[PDB]
Amino acid sequence: GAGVSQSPRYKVAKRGQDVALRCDPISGHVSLFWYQQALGQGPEFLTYFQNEAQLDKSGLPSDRFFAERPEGSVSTLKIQRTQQEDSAVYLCASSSRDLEQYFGPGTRLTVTEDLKNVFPPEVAVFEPSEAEISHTQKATLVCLATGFYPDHVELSWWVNGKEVHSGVCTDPQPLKEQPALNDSRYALSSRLRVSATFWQNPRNHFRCQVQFYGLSENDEWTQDRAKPVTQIVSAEAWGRA
Amino acid sequence: QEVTQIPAALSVPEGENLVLNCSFTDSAIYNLQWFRQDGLTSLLLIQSSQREQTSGRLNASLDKSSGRSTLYIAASQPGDSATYLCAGVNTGFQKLVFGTGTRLLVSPNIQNPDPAVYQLRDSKDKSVCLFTDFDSQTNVSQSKDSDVYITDKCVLDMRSMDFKSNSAVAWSNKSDFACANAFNNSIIPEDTFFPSP
């Protein structure tokens, strides 16, 4: 209500299928904007609504892209017969009388040739080295998330069921598993560093959780392997004296 | 309208002040907004009449004559590392026109460098190599062997201990893979510690 919301947060689509992206502006805001952002670039204006009226459509591609806001509240950006080049972050913003634009969290869209390209990560936890413990009296755990596609993941660390942020670093960018090729699955690493005394308590439970955003009930699945639906993949370790 | 942001990438040691610039070809600006991206976090909004705006250690100026906006970040911290975007609204329009962004990395001041490469075993015969505790002037190069995976360096902050550290992770399924050679493509400190098994 007090902030701009967007749904779905992530979307993987089959080339040629239509997609619909939703934006809920801040309650009662007159102005609504759509922007498209390519990886490592700046957002590019698509379209602007004043209530239900689409006053400036100048940034929309000449075909397949159509936005709607029929009651001047919720807006839907529809992309017909999606193509690979449509992969981007779609951002929605709203503004009231002061004209300051507030942005939503975005929709990350990946258009792929076939949904058989979608894979959840495998997740593994690597325990601290005894040599690090004796050298520094610190203990670094590593989590690896490998073989996933698209890059629609959220990794978190949990200690005795409580999320931890201090002493953590997750790679800002994933690695390509097939670096010579254009089509590649991804890997991602994270570290959690604690004091050695904390790691040495066998009652302490450490879990690395990766939420992967994948297929929905509506997506068709014909491969013999498990459907790569949205899921959590985790790995864990217990402290060691 | 064309919005030019310079530099495209900036690396600065923590503690220094830094400058981000944003120039626009069309000086008929209604509003100028600076954002942070780690969606978009609004940092500052400058009006057509206003020549500056401030929020904490962030201060942005708008020079109406030279068609420029400068974002000043005082006493930079590693937590300031993010992409910074500049955007302007032209008089008579509503849309924002963005620059391509500045990717900022504020490097931690490693008060006691102790570079080392440790071997870590799976909690469940799998292992990883962890290059850690090197100074921020050390860069980690990408792997030259396709079947050896090496991440970029990452800064972790044990905030209750006033301790920050850099690290990068390497792993492989190859038989000849050993932590002694994992980071062979990087400039690693001569004093790097390679522990015994």
Residue numbers in the entry:
A (entry chain B): 1 to 31, 39 to 61, 66 to 81, 83 to 253
B (entry chain A): 2 to 32, 39 to 45, 49 to 62, 66 to 68, 74 to 142, 145 to 217
How does the study describe this entry?
The CD1 family of MHC-class I-like molecules present an array of endogenous and foreign lipids Ags that are recognized by specialized T-cell populations. Here we describe a diverse population of CD1d–α-GalCer reactive cells that we termed ‘atypical NKT cells' because they lack the invariant TRAV10+TRAJ18+ α-chain and the TRBV25-1 β-chain that are inherent to type I NKT cells. Crystal structures of two of these atypical NKT TCRs in complex with CD1d–α-GalCer showed that, in contrast to type I NKT cell TCRs that dock over the F′-pocket of CD1d–α-GalCer, these atypical TCRs docked orthogonally over the A′-pocket of CD1d–α-GalCer. Thus, variations in the CD1d–α-GalCer-reactive NKT TCR repertoire can manifest in alternative docking strategies on CD1d and diverse reactivity towards CD1d-restricted lipids.
To confirm the non-canonical TRBV25-1− atypical NKT cell TCRs were indeed CD1d-restricted, we generated a panel of Jurkat T-cell lines transduced with TRBV25-1− TCRs and examined their ability to bind CD1d tetramers loaded with a range of lipid Ags. We selected four TRBV25-1− TCRs that represented a cross-section of the TCRα and TCRβ chain usage: clones 9C1 (TRAV21+TRAJ8+TRBV7–8+; Table 1, sequence #13); 9B1 (TRAV38-1+TRAJ48+TRBV9; Table 1, sequence #1); 9B2 (TRAV12-3+TRAJ27+TRBV6-5+; Table 1, sequence #2); 9B3 (TRAV13-2+TRAJ24+TRBV20-1+; Table 1, sequence #3) and two controls, namely a Jurkat pHLA-specific irrelevant TCR (TRAV17+TRBV16+) and an SKW3 TRAV10+TRAJ18+TRBV25-1+ type I NKT TCR+ cell line (SKW3.NKT15). Using surface plasmon resonance (SPR), we next determined the affinity of two atypical NKT TCRs from clones 9C1 and 9B2, towards CD1d bound to α-GalCer and variants thereof. These two TCRs were selected based on their contrasting Ag reactivity profiles, whereby the 9C1 TCR demonstrated a strong dependence on α-GalCer for activation, whereas the 9B2 TCR, whilst still reactive to CD1d–α-GalCer tetramers, demonstrated an auto-reactive profile that was associated with less Ag-specific activation. We also determined the structure of the 9C1 TCR in the non-liganded state, thereby allowing us to compare the mode, and plasticity of atypical NKT TCR recognition to that of typical type I TCR recognition of CD1d–α-GalCer. The 9C1 TCR did not undergo a major structural rearrangement on CD1d–α-GalCer engagement, although the CDR3 loops moved to bind the α-GalCer moiety. To enable this, the CDR3β residues (Ser108β, Arg109β, Asp110β and Leu111β) and Gln112α in the CDR3α rearranged to accommodate the Ag. Notably, the characteristics and conformation of the TRAJ8-encoded CDR3α loop of the 9C1 TCR contrasted that of the polar-rich TRAJ18-encoded CDR3α loop of the NKT15 TCR.
